[PDB]
Structures are given as C-alpha cells and as structure tokens.
C-alpha cells in the first residue's frame with residue numbers, strides 16, 4: 122500500500138480486481154502484540170455446593 | 177390426661193435437690209432412701225427389670241435409649257467373667273448441670289441406685305466416673321459412700337441379702353469426650369479417652385473386657401424410687417413412650433437460672449415462664465432456645481410457642497432433647513458468635529481419633545470464625561451444610577453428630593441473618 126497510483130491502477134487493471142481493499146500484506150489493522158491481562162471463566166462444576174463427583 | 181406440667185412436690189423423686197436438707201445417711205433415711213431395700217434385693221433381677229420396663233424410663237444422658245431394654249441385654253449368665261454397672265457422671269454437656277446436683281445433694285440416692293441397678297443385671301461392682309472438675313462433689317460422694325459402708329448397706333452382704341457389691345469412684349481429668357460411654361470405658365482402663373467402635377457393645381465387652389452397662393446418674397438414681405413408689409406411678413406421668421420426670425437446667429438469658437424437676441411433657445413456654453421468672457425482656461424478647469444442651473439444634477421463637485419438652489415432640493420439632501438443658505438466647509444475642517463459640521468448644525473438646533470429626537469440626541470452626549465477621553460469600557452457606565452432612569453419620573460416636581447439629585440448626589433457621597451479615601461485610605469492608 123505504498124505503491125503510487127500509476128502502478129496501483131496498472132495493477133488493478135492487470136488483475137481485473139480491486140486489490141487495495143483486500144491486501145494480503147498486513148498493516149496497522151491487526152491486533153497489538155502486547156495484550157491486556159485475561160480473566161478466563163471457570164467451568165460449570167466450580168461450585169462449592171452440590172459437587173458430589175458421582176452425580 | 178392431655179395437660180402436662182405443674183408437677184406437685186409430693187411426686188418429686190428428687191427431694192433435697194437444692195441443699196436445704198441434710199445430705200448424709202441419717203438425713204437420707206429421713207427422706208425415704210435406703211428404706212425396704214432387702215425386699216427389693218430378694219425379688220430377683222427379673223422383677224426389677226420388669227419394674228423398669230413397665231415404668232417407661234428412657235435414657236437421661238443424651239441418647240434417649242430405653243432403660244429397661246438396655247439393662248435387659250445384661251440379663252445373661254456369666255462364663256467366668258464378672259459384670260459391671262458403671263454410672264456416667266461426667267456431665268460435660270454445656271447447659272447441663274443436673275448430675276452435679278444429684279451427686280452434691282443426694283449422694284445416697286445415687287449409691288442406692290448403683291446397688292439396685294447392679295442387682296438388676298447381676299453386676300459385681302460399680303464405678304462412678306465422676307468428672308475431674310467436680311472434686312468437691314467427689315469428696316462429698318466419697319463421704320456418703322463411707323457412710324454406706326459403715327452401716328452394712330453395701331460391701332459384704334449388702335442389706336442382708338448375700339449379694340456382694342462394691343462401689344468405686346473414678347475421677348476424670350478434663351475431657352468432654354469421656355462423657356460418651358465407650359470413651360468412658362476407655363478412660364477407666366487408664367488409656368486415652370478415645371471411643372470404641374460398636375459392635376462389640378458394652379453389654380458384651382465393656383470395661384476391662386467384662387460386660388458393662390454405662391448408665392447416667394439421673395437414670396440410675398431414680399430407679400429405686402421407681403421400684404418403691406411403683407412403675408405404674410412413674411409411667412403415669414408424661415405422654416406415651418415419654419414417661420417420667422426430668423431435671424431441667426434453665427440457663428442463659430433468663431432472670432433466674434435454675435435446676436428444677438418437672439414432668440416430662442411440659443410445655444417449654446410454661447417451664448421458662450414459671451420456674452425461671454421469664455426471659456430477660458419478656459417473651460417478646462425471645463430470639464432462640466438451644467433446647468437440650470449444646471448437641472441439640474436450636475429452635476426459634478415460633479417453635480418455642482407450642483412445643484413439648486419430651487423426646488418425640490422435639491423429634492417433630494426436628495431437634496433433640498438429650499439432657500434437657502434450656503439455653504435461652506434473647507434478641508440482644510449475637511447468635512452467630514454464640515454458635516461459633518460452641519463450635520470452638522467442640523474443637524477444643526474432641527479426642528481426634530477418626531478423620532471426619534477431627535477435620536470437619538476444626539474446618540467448621542474456621543468457617544464460623546469467618547461467618548461471625550462475615551468474611552465469606554453466601555454460596556459457602558449450603559457448602560457448610562454439606563460439611564455437616566459429611567460429618568453426620570460417618571463418625572464413631574455422636575460428637576460428630578453433636579457438632580454437626582448446631583450448625584445445621586443455625587443455618588436452617590437463620591439463613592437470611594447470615595446472608596445480611598455477609599452482605600454488610602461486603603459493603604463495609606470493600
């Protein structure tokens with residue numbers, strides 16, 4: 122997405138498609154590599170009552 | 177008869193309960209005791225067992241087992257080994273201070289009970305396992321037993337019947353678990369007071385390996401009075417299968433705490449408002465009543481309206497009676513702190529033998545120590561219930577049951593008070 126408009130237009134003509142809307146090279150649109158700390162939920166049997174394992 | 181209570185003074189078995197009369201033997205024959213004992217001893221064990229089975233006497237120590245069927249397990253011939261009637265006198269039950277009154281004020285009645293009960297099953301000798309903390313009662317009882325030996329009433333040729341019979345007194349050393357019958361048997365033998373497993377029952381193998389009946393002071397001391405006054409007289413009181421009289425111990429937030437004898441099926445409201453002078457602040461100030469000592473689940477003010485203080489009506493009140501100790505708790509009482517202190521009692525008085533009591537009582541006390549402050553979340557209420565339902569019925573004796581039962585009663589009758597306690601913890605500490 123650094124190509125100038127002449128090469129960009131020639132490339133859109135030779136492909137016959139619209140390429141700058143769907144780029145395969147990734148840019149700032151991706152998630153950030155440093156993520157917030159997660160807090161995952163627990164399973165449904167993490168309960169202090171009615172936790173008899175035979176049931 | 178359907179109206180019970182208001183027992184007359186002429187039908188009281190326990191004359192000189194308060195200490196206003198002479199407790200010694202010349203004062204004991206002035207109150208009817210040690211009278212016509214030879215004609216009791218010469219009618220055989222079977223007439224005595226029949227007069228106990230006719231009387232409808234049940235257990236007075238915390239069990240409620242019938243007395244005559246209990247003593248009839250020991251009506252078997254010997255095979256070289258003797259038999260022993262041991263009287264449980266430990267009385268570690270919180271609320272219950274009645275056998276202390278029987279030992280301190282009517283000791284000759286207890287010795288006559290030992291003699292007649294040992295005649296009733298062919299026992300060789302008697303052991304009175306008195307509490308170690310009752311040292312004044314122990315010396316009181318030993319002076320009375322000396323006066324019993326120095327008249328020819330017990331010992332060699334007891335009351336002129338050719339039936340040899342000793343009476344011993346063994347003192348405890350400060351263990352509530354020695355109140356239970358098998359741990360009392362283990363405490364006489366000179367070991368750690370850790371309860372035995374049934375079977376073998378004490379009626380087959382009890383103390384020292386001899387057949388032994390451990391019976392409470394109250395259910396022993398009234399049986400010569402049953403044999404003299406009449407079994408139909410003693411079964412004429414109370415409701416059906418709930419006969420007799422009972423020494424009630426009304427303590428706590430009453431105006432006048434008292435040990436007082438009353439007919440078995442007396443209403444609790446009538447008992448408190450007559451013999452104790454009412455709850456502090458009145459009956460409108462009544463929050464809860466621990467009905468029969470520490471091992472019974474408490475009942476709130478709506479249950480204390482109509483309930484009868486015998487075994488079957490408290491079973492219908494989904495609680496127990498036991499030793500009939502009325503611990504009264506008014507509205508000014510922090511109920512959670514009281515039950516947590518009672519669970520602290522049950523962890524400082526528990527012998528530590530098997531795993532469910534040894535772990536669950538300490539773990540319930542930690543949960544109750546968080547519940548008093550409120551340091552929990554409400555989903556730990558029913559979980560604690562399951563903790564009680566993992567103790568109740570999986571132990572050796574009924575101290576695990578007696579420690580699970582107060583927490584069950586507290587939760588089952590005061591759950592929303594615990595929930596508001598923990599939500600106000602949540603708002604004022606976070």
Ligand SMILES: Cc1cc2nc3c(=O)[nH]c(=O)nc-3n(C[C@H](O)[C@H](O)[C@H](O)COP(=O)(O)O)c2cc1C
Pocket residue numbers: 234235236237238239240241243246264265266267268269352353354355356357358390391392393395573574575578
């Ligand atoms: C934890 C526990 C403590 C007990 N403490 C006493 C006691 O202090 N005094 C007593 O007479 N019975 C006590 N008992 C009841 C005895 O096990 C037994 O029932 C009693 O010695 C004789 O029963 P009886 O009432 O038929 O005579 C206790 C039971 C348990 C489970």
Ligand code: SF4
Pocket residue numbers: 353370371526527528529530531532533534571572573574575576
């Ligand atoms: S449950 Fe408790 S009181 Fe009973 S034998 Fe075990 S340690 Fe003793």
